[PDB]
Amino acid sequence: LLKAVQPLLKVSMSMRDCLILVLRKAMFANQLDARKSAVAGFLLLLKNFKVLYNSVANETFCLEIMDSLRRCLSQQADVRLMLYEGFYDVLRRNSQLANSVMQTLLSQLKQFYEPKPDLLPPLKLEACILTQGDKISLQEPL
Amino acid sequence: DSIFVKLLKISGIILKTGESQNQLAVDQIAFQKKLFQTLRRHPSYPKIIEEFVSGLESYIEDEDSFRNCLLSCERLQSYSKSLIKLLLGIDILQPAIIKTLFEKLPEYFFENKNSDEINIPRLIVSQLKWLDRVVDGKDLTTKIMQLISIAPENLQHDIITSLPEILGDSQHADVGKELSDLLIENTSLTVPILDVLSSLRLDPNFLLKVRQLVMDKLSSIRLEDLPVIIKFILHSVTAMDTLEVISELREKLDLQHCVSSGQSCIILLFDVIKSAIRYEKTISEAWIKAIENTASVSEHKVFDLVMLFIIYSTNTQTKKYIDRVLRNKIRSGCIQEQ
Amino acid sequence: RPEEGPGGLPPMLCPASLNICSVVSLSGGTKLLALSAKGR
Amino acid sequence: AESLELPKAIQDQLPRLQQLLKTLEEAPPVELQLLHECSPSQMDLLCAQLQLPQLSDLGLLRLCTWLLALSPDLSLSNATVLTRSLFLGRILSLTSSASRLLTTALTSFCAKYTYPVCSALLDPVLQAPGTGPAQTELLCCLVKMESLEPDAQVLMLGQILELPWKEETFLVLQSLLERQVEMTPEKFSVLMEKLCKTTSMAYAKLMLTVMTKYQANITETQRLGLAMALEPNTTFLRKSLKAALKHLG
Amino acid sequence: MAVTEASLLRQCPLLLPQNRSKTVYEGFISAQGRDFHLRIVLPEDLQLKNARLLCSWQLRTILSGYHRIVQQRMQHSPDLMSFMMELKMLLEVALKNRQELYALPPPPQFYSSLIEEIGTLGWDKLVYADTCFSTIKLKAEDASGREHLITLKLKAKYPAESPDYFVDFPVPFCASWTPQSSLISIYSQFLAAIESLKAFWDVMDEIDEKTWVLEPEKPPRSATARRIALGNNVSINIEVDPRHPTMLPECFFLGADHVVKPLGIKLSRNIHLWDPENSVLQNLKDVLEIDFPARAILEKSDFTMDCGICYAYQLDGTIPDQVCDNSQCGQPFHQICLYEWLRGLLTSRQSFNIIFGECPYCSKPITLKM
Ligand SMILES: [Zn+2]
């Protein structure tokens, strides 16, 4: 839908600021798909748009989205996976948020990389997988 | 000269005057662990916390120094987190910082829009969102409940709406209890509360109790919200409670009491209904059963015509059903001229 | 202009004329005859 | 029981008026114009004769509706009389917040007969025991009224200051003081002397607002009376209190 | 108090019983910082059924159009206490209705402080002051070098309450008034609003110069809508958001059904090339792939560009808008006039907000959407 109706969000600035209320509120909503799609729509706004009036509050508000997305990086694996695939697409428009993206990745990478030579498993593969009574799942697709 | 500033300088943060972002000699995690182990090892171990926070509050008697302490920091080697957030990362100081922070918030009720269009109270409550770990998640809860009960209207509205970014996943139920208790207390704060409660984690039973609890109070709501409240009731309706809730609504609503002012707000109402009933079929057949099943009392109200018309205009499976019902009604001496 | 709350009033930058009289022209504007305090 | 005489035309038109009131639940009459014949004491009985407390909430407003059209004004005493017949029992009855109707009805009726509604109702609702949330809210609305002109606001002030103070008084008083309602230093000092006398959350707010808004009317003497009041740590927000307190220091 | 010993003193301080028998009151009665003279004679007994009530001629003036109310109240009211209560409340009504008799400025802090504050501003700013000193109008300059005025209307107390501010620009102005705030304070607020809109002003002034603005004429600063002419007897009207002016506006066309089709098509295909880093005109020109006329006035001065029903340009705001879908007529009309014609014809039939039927001049199918 949101990709299909997106030429609306290019044109109509009220649509953007009306959807943003809905996305931010659906981010904490108790259904799972609510947060996935809210992330999705969010990535689609920064992908497809710079402005979401000076082009400095644009930047701070994009950075605000990305800070909430930085928290989303510690949801379950799927949300993080979608984020990743998105971040390339966020760069490929919005070069201006390059550094604020790449650190965002690198930080989360350095949770699962060890910086010393002469330790042969340079990655903690147990640390990727969480188990809560015999149900065992991935978080952070490396 | 103060214990606070000296511990901060040794630990590796540059305390600037208060106009521009404080510089940082060291990494934040490094800083945190450095001051942590420093205060651990330092003699007079329980009293250095008291000395630390007294130095802090004596430093933040001036606004601008605290304003820079509240703001995001400068990395020299380029833009970082705030020192309060980082300092709140340490568990031993945490409840104390919270005490202080909240204690001094009521200074800023009446001095609104001073310099950079920045709502100091919004900023201070924004400091608590998204915390790594709260030393007490119950003490913060009780303190924000005192705060939420007291503040003026806008600020109350603001901090409340800020609740789910703040809270983890534990101290939800007590908030639920307290908010429903505030909801029977105050009618003004239905909407933002109902929003909050759709965002927090509750028992279904609690939802249903608050539903019956708002709806008893349904005449007691100023018009403007009346829309969004029914919005809630009918997004929140289950399949099974459908006809009771509809019956209750159908009883409790009026289309008579309200009445440019009355009509616009009513019109929005009917839009909200149109949506609800357009996008969920079971409301319609259930709705008509709830007038048809109330064949008894000759005395049925404006709502009921308006609503049959409407449903005929919308989902057309029911047209025959409406017509037989509307005939049975007219012949029965209910439904008439006046 | 019912009529008026305060009677706020300009001079005509003429002196103390006592015993004014008006002739309404409608020919140009209004043309009045006065006797000045000095006797003019 | 006293055998008060109601005026001739009201006693004689007394069934017609109870008839027109039935009409209301379902442009005002000349029979409604007969209220203008009554003294308040005649009125006082009359309201009791008509059984106005028993109108539906709608029927109340739809009366208020018709009452609101009345030229001339129902006098200070008469409008006062009416309202406390009509509204007071429902008010005292309240287990939860008012109907939209009442609040409108109240506030609309208060719109025209602001002080009379205000003169009647404020004082004895508060001096009632178990005055709780339902009650205080509608009282907020009296003292929040755009309608409430400086005259009426200080009539509210004058009226509030006569009362045995308690938590519920402060809530309503803060909401009047919220407006930046002006005071004689006498009136304020009565606020102050009463105000100095402590452990409730509400109390603190009241003190705090004045300390900030009427800093411009706070004397030495009065500031020192706060100092003693805020001594206790029962009080949360002593600090912001101290800061605002200090900010006058 | 309860009893009219103390309650009478407390509520009419300025009434002195002259006789021993409290039968003749005299003195004053208070209302809105104003005492009025009054001498209120009772009979031997305390009966207002029969009672004289004499006044100052100042008071008689203010109780004209209430003499019946007063006479009723005397006869119907129980005691003197409640009489005086009702009389005062009635004076509050009388004066508050005739509010135009008031607002006298105090000599000590008005005429001096306002000149002090205007000195604090600068005397190049002020453009008007009223001889009541009630109205002032003040001026400010853009970075662009454009004049924007602001009227204040001020009370007997300027610094106590807010001054009534009337300002041109379309979005509502908010002024944080304190007793400590002043003319420079609220002037700085005005400059802030100005510099924030600056883009908006520049976009609409750029329009007014470089294109034939048509359906505002002598436009205000509040106006967000701009019916531009393009070609001849086809137009485009344009409502633009102040906060995001360079952003796309709500846009639509009047003109010939056969002329307007391709413009809508081309707009739909080019609207993605809308860009809020260019100007309104610099985006429209390359979106719609056209140039504008700059006021085709001299050549087609009296070509008959009127309704062809009433033969007028400007029917009460109305412009010739509705045309014929025909190469040989092209005749403009008005909404009102063409409805009133077409409503009559036996040929005409109405759909929902549409009327079908014959162009007056050429008798070809013409459609009117109300
Ligand atoms: Zn034609």
Ligand SMILES: [Zn+2]
């Ligand atoms: Zn015409």
